Symmetry: D2
């Protein structure tokens, strides 16, 4: 029972620190209203928040979970590309973006796939990772810890501790690397339908404390020593995989290439080899042998409540194209994405709008009866949509249509 | 007037009911994406596509919670998204004040990752009590790297030699710059692969990120180059040598967009009280994680803790291209002992390829403009073209440093989990 | 020698077939040199290229073709290298001035600091063929099959039947659409083992073909090994011998032998070997000059010098140590040392002499693989000595002056 | 003096008051005797005393070696030298010397030369030429390092440093500068021509002089190291691949369909299929930066050892992208190209000063300095290396395509 003004006067005098507003204020929306008012007086243009919406949005799912010092929300247009004829099913793919032509392009690639009998995909691997950096007094000591971790006995004991932290966290393997007295241990584990970063970090924490029982001299320098690797480009993710590794493929009949894509199979292939393979090689790329996988990955991620910062590594992709058919005029295309970091429960997937987009795809929440299937399905959809996107952009580049917008 | 009338009578030119438009669309074959053409309002076209979509979903009511009402679609249509079915609200938090180059910024961050804003805000606090941060823009130029092809490598080599002459460069520059007042071809980096020739055009672009502007200018320069070498085949305006939205050593080494460096010294006291650790611990974690760890992982440009988190959050809030986080996140963060007792913490973050702009694309939408205005960098800087974009790049580099400081502190103190 | 040239000028008898028709190796080389001479713009150029009094019998048929002589490479010695409580005299073949002297100086600092310690972390030569199935769905199936205990068992049996040392450790598989890259890894006794692994790979691929007849074997080497090309896979997974060595150099030794301080050494190490290499976009090149040491020892010991591309992979680390943090701790980690003590150039007498000097010539019969492992440790230890000295010279500003 | 004492007396004296041993040539009169005594001293420290019995040392010119190419010398290592050729390149025919102990390498390279010759020859071009050195310097603050970078980028700034750099030698001409900041650190890549010399020494001296001049403008600058690994020398690095180092070269040739079948024992189509999936796709899957080839390192290394080059530089000199394509009236002939951006090579200085390696350089007609066109001999050698690599790629790739590698 106070006025917005009084609460403001109460905060200005170091008493309630801006970020603690919802802790005291009744309405979540009012707490946001008040923070915007404090913010106004610190801006060279006080009315700069006028166009930033905040009213009538469910903050209950956000506060204490997805964002701090909330001042509103940012609307990102959502378009739909589809149907994506994938694995004998049809999907309507939601895409959150502000880049014109991206939805139209992806939709067109979907069209060429649908008229071609559809695409097929497979999940090759599933395991989120965490790569802590640990340190022993000497390299001879860290060497000893690596050999121990490499024994079936050592692996058994740390797996017991890792798995003891969650019903869904199942340690699959360990990849260890030495740098003198430093030891990088790459923990790889299943995580149900969650992307798993949190669950994996906890497992690593418990597993490391257990390892410490056997080697008291070991110093745990950081639970993440950048050997995961999370949100930074790294050859290890490309070569070893991280999260879901998947492959997609489709054959686009010669006539579909000409009618829908406005180009030829031979042109498509020539551009692919010389842009996505040779071009990427000349640029010194590790994992970027594709046209614009990141665009598709980013749009689906924002629409489906994923962690968009993970587009850095989730975008890794190699797109291949070759002649197919009795006459060799049809287009075979494949996209291989070894490190899709994705999930359908927790984080932003907890928010209603993002859940709507996930429901649209039929992968919302946990898959009881088959843990991880909702996340694996979303990964396949991502890989398939990337392929649809690749098909369209490559067709435009081959035809000299990138100009069109 | 509803109970569906026959299609013939339904031929429109308010006009008709939803059921009838839906019937016309299904009967004839007006794909859902052309709705805004016929419909009097953008919102009704959206409402209809949504209704058409529901019928194709296994859970028809899945769109229930996907908002769509009361949103300016006129700004979206024809420039930002097609086949629109609504919008996705991303929570926006604020970290500040960020004390950068004697100014104070309130940095908006759009995210769904808990603690990211709190952590960036904490780093800002340490920077502020440390007397502020300073930054410099080292280079500025967007790029496009087309792949071109000649009959033989001796021919492509000939084109490369020609492009490297002051004579040939001037002619190409002329054609390139004629594309617009802001297109100013700075330089050319060429790479040969047998008979293929990769040409990296680089140029300022005012306050725009410049992707479209540079592409058009590149298309005209190649047109001009083709006059001199009619046997040259333009294989693709983008042959992945730019490089756009894919990890590439070339962006790390040559830069792309804005190259920025930032720095600050955090007093030993502020490291203990605000960051909950010591200078020595921060340094030991920095070297072994950001340098050695990244090296062991085979990273090119990923010598940092979480620049991508900061870049992505600001990008989404300010109408940038979030897919550009791939290369924009490139960053190396260094930490070192500083001061009298060597107990203070020197830190710097160097980001060679921030791809950013304050005009065009998503920056034309109102909510994003509000976030750009909050920073005082919205739209073009008529008096000093490109200054608003440069300023935003400096802010992005500064906020990344604040983020790096806080996460690294938590890692050193064991506060991540 | 004069009348023989006549015959060769006529068809049906190429220059590379001379040894088969002549009674002496040397004479064969001599005639080839005379034949070659007539085609040179400067016929007398071969005047200083030696060829006499050399054992070609061991070379021809296994080490080189169309032989016209030999190339002498100066061999110097650096040591003693005090490693794992032993003392080694390291032979180094080079034409680079100051290299042996620098390496010798690094050995000196290490010996005055009580020696170095090393450990072999892994051992396994690899081969990475590329096969292809009709569809990615089929490739995915072959990958899944290979990952089952049943599938791995059958191809391991086939692989291991090609040799007593062919003992398949594991498979790392990567998919690229319908292509499938399979990385076979195995111990190989004391041989570098490229030949053995390749043959074991061929037999296993045919076995795999019996289970998947639609599988096309594109190449025994699809560049996934990876042999003699820079690749992150070798850096991350290892190839050949993965080794780590270390030592602590007393502050006094850093000053008197190395002419610098521990602090300056550390600053140069971090900013050159860590930060510089990062700015240059290096994958695996986090060192000063490991390649120099690797190359000289390889040439001296009959190794394959072309393998210095991957074998030189190294991360050199330095930090303050001891009671007053003034002593220098240094470590060198090399994950992909491709080496051997039997086969190829190691069958030649001069190179066998350099190998014997190290006590690692030939096979270790009572403990197969121990001679190659010991040599790998010597290489890593010597690289560390080389790193110490060059880094000291860069810190004190003595590179050019030396 | 020394000749009046016996080997045993010298040994007893070296051990007596501890003479290093690397100093034996200071004491003893003849070069060969200093080597003999070092061998004797060393032998007593070996688990097997006679292990040096087969390491030759006699009848070798040590005068050219001592004080220039090696120290603490105990002999020399003979590397068999074979010849591949003729290599028909740019309307000329080269007989290529290759020092190797790897069986089939010379045969295979000779085979590829055969295919090229029957195809009308190869063509090559030198795209760029400039040795580099990339020192690391440090300023008190990032703002200061930014200032140095901006200064080096001005024409005035570049002119003064170039004057200082070039003042170092008649053949040292600074071409360009590439800079990179890392906080308060500044990495400056100096790139310069160097006549026919590989240039590392010359380039390093010029850099030293240029940095001392830069220090006049920036007294607060600390020169941390003359090589901050930004060159980059003898370590794999994307900068060499993208920017070039030494000589950037490209080579090409078309092999008639008949020749592919008869000489190479395979098919044009098979070759292309193997090239794409091995050299492009495979290298990509392996995370390669610059290794988009089959075995350029084998050829580079063999020619380097035979011609007195620095074999350690095979690390970056091997960088190569091999491309293959269908060509001709019926799309049945084989177009192949190899592009090598960073061949570090020279024909003057170092081991290039020894007679045996000078003989191999003379074979190619590239020994020493080109009087009328400084650098032309080194450039010709780089063209030959690239052409020979291409010959080598042709043969191994044919063998891999036909299932012939292991025999
Ligand atoms: C815009 C573009 C799709 C135009 O399509 P087009 O092949 O020239 O010709 P059409 O307009 O007849 O349509 C072809 C197909 O595209 C799709 N498409 C075209 N315009 C569309 C739009 N505005 N909205 C949604 N989907 C669209 C349709 O699904 C399909 O036609 P149909 O299903 O009605 O039979 C094409 O120029 C393109 O994809 N450009 C490349 C964009 C790109 O990838 N850039 C980088 C990412 S932004
Ligand atoms: C959550 C975290 C910020 C709290 O740290 P802390 O030092 O124990 O918290 P404190 O209560 O002592 O406050 C210290 C500072 O944190 C910041 N801060 C803390 N909680 C905050 C919140 N809810 N919202 C905004 N800012 C917050 C403030 O700027 C500052 O406090 P102040 O108002 O007194 O000036 C810290 O644990 C952290 O940063 N974790 C790492 C998160 C991360 O980077 N992980 C990956 C990205 S999500
Ligand atoms: C040439 C260099 C070794 C001389 O070092 P220095 O410390 O200035 O000279 P010193 O007379 O004090 O000798 C110090 C130590 O160096 C070693 N050393 C010096 N000259 C040597 C020589 N000519 N031969 C062999 N070993 C030598 C000795 O092991 C040791 O002395 P000691 O064993 O007699 O007690 C040194 O400047 C250096 O290593 N430069 C760097 C070279 C380099 O790494 N470049 C790249 C590869 S070539
Ligand atoms: C061994 C190999 C050279 C034989 O090739 P082949 O075509 O089947 O054998 P041929 O007798 O038909 O000769 C074909 C050509 O090879 C070359 N050649 C064959 N044996 C040779 C030898 N011993 N010495 C020199 N050149 C030889 C010839 O130049 C040429 O024949 P010609 O000049 O007499 O007309 C071939 O199998 C090969 O190159 N394998 C791959 C080796 C490789 O690159 N591995 C990795 C590097 S070591
Ligand atoms: C076209 C592209 O730049 C992506 C985009 O425009 O959003 C990617 C490419 O380089 O092909
Ligand atoms: C902590 C980190 O995983 C990022 C995040 O949690 O969002 C990055 C790292 O330090 O590896
Ligand atoms: C000194 C060095 O160039 C190697 C050499 O000269 O033989 C390596 C470096 O430190 O860059
Ligand atoms: C055959 C090869 O290994 C090189 C060699 O054996 O000398 C290279 C390749 O991977 O093709």
């Amino acid at each position: 029972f106070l006025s917005d003004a009084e609460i403001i006067q109460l905060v200005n005098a170091k008493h309630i620190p801006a970020y603690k507003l919802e802790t005291l204020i009744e309405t979540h929306e009012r707490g946001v209203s008040i923070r915007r008012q404090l913010l106004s007086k610190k801006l060279s243009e006080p009315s700069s928040l006028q166009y930033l919406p905040y009213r009538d949005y469910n903050y209950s799912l956000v506060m204490g979970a997805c964002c701090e010092n909330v001042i509103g929300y940012m609307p990102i247009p959502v378009g739909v590309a589809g149907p994506l004829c994938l694995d004998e099913k049809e999907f309507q793919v939601p895409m959150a973006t502000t880049e014109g032509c991206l939805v139209a392009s992806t939709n067109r690639g979907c069209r060429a796939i649908g008229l071609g009998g559809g695409a097929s995909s497979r999940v090759l691997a599933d395991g989120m990772t965490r790569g802590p950096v640990v340190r022993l007094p000497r390299a001879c000591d860290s060497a000893e810890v690596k050999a121990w971790l490499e024994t079936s006995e050592g692996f058994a004991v740390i797996k017991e501790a890792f798995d003891s932290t969650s019903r869904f966290a199942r340690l699959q393997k360990l990849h260890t690397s030495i740098a003198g007295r430093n030891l990088y241990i790459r923990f790889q584990s299943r995580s149900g339908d969650a992307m798993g970063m949190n669950m994996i970090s906890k497992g690593t924490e418990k597993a490391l404390s257990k390892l410490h029982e056997y080697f008291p001299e070991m110093q745990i320098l950081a639970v993440s020593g950048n050997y995961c690797t999370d949100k930074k480009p790294a050859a290890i993710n490309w070569i070893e995989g991280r999260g879901k590794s998947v492959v997609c493929e489709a054959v686009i009949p010669a006539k579909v290439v000409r009618e829908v894509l406005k180009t030829t199979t031979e042109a498509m292939i020539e551009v692919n080899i010389n842009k996505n393979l040779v071009g990427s090689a000349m640029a010194g790329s590790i994992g970027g042998y594709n046209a614009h996988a990141a665009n598709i990955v980013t749009a689906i991620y924002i629409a489906c409540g994923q962690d968009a910062a993970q587009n850095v590594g989730s975008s890794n992709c190699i797109t291949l194209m070759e002649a197919s058919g009795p006459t060799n005029e049809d287009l075979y295309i494949s996209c291989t994405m070894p490190s899709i970091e994705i999930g359908t429960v927790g984080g932003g997937t907890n928010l209603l709008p993002q859940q709507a987009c996930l429901q649209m795809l039929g992968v919302q929440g946990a898959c009881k009866d088959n843990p991880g299937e909702n996340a694996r399905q979303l990964a396949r959809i991502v890989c398939g949509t990337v392929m649809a996107g690749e098909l369209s952009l490559m067709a435009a580049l081959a035809a000299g249509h990138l100009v069109k917008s």
